[PDB]
C-alpha cells in the first residue's frame, strides 16, 4: 500500500466494539467515524 497512515488512540474496554466499520452511537460519532469500506487492521492491546 502507498501509505499506511497508522493511527493512535487509547479507549476503555467498552469502545472496542465501537471502533468498527459502520457503527453508530455517541462514541465513534463524536470522535472517530472509521468510515465503512475502509481497508483496516485495528489492534487493541491491554494497557492497564
Amino acid at each position: 500500500f502507498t501509505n499506511v497512515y497508522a493511527d493512535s488512540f487509547v479507549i476503555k474496554g467498552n469502545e472496542v466494539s465501537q471502533i468498527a466499520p459502520g457503527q453508530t452511537g455517541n462514541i465513534a460519532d463524536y470522535n472517530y467515524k472509521l468510515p465503512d469500506d475502509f481497508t483496516g487492521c485495528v489492534i487493541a492491546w491491554n494497557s492497564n
Binding site: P21, G22, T24, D36, D37
Partner: protein
C-alpha cells in the same frame, strides 16, 4: 485467536454491511445422462 468472527447485523447499517441471503445453483450441462429439469411438452417420436 478464535478462527470465527461473528457479525452483529443491525437495521442501521448501510447497504454494504446489511445481510443478504444467497442461493448458488451449481450444475453441469454437458454430462450425458440427466435425471432432472426441463419444463417442456413432449411430442411423439417420428423414428424416420
Amino acid at each position: 485467536y478464535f478462527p470465527l468472527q461473528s457479525y452483529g447485523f443491525r437495521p442501521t447499517y448501510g447497504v454494504g454491511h446489511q445481510p443478504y441471503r444467497v442461493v448458488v445453483l451449481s450444475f453441469e450441462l454437458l454430462h450425458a445422462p440427466a435425471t432432472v429439469c426441463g419444463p417442456k411438452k413432449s411430442t411423439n417420436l417420428v423414428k424416420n
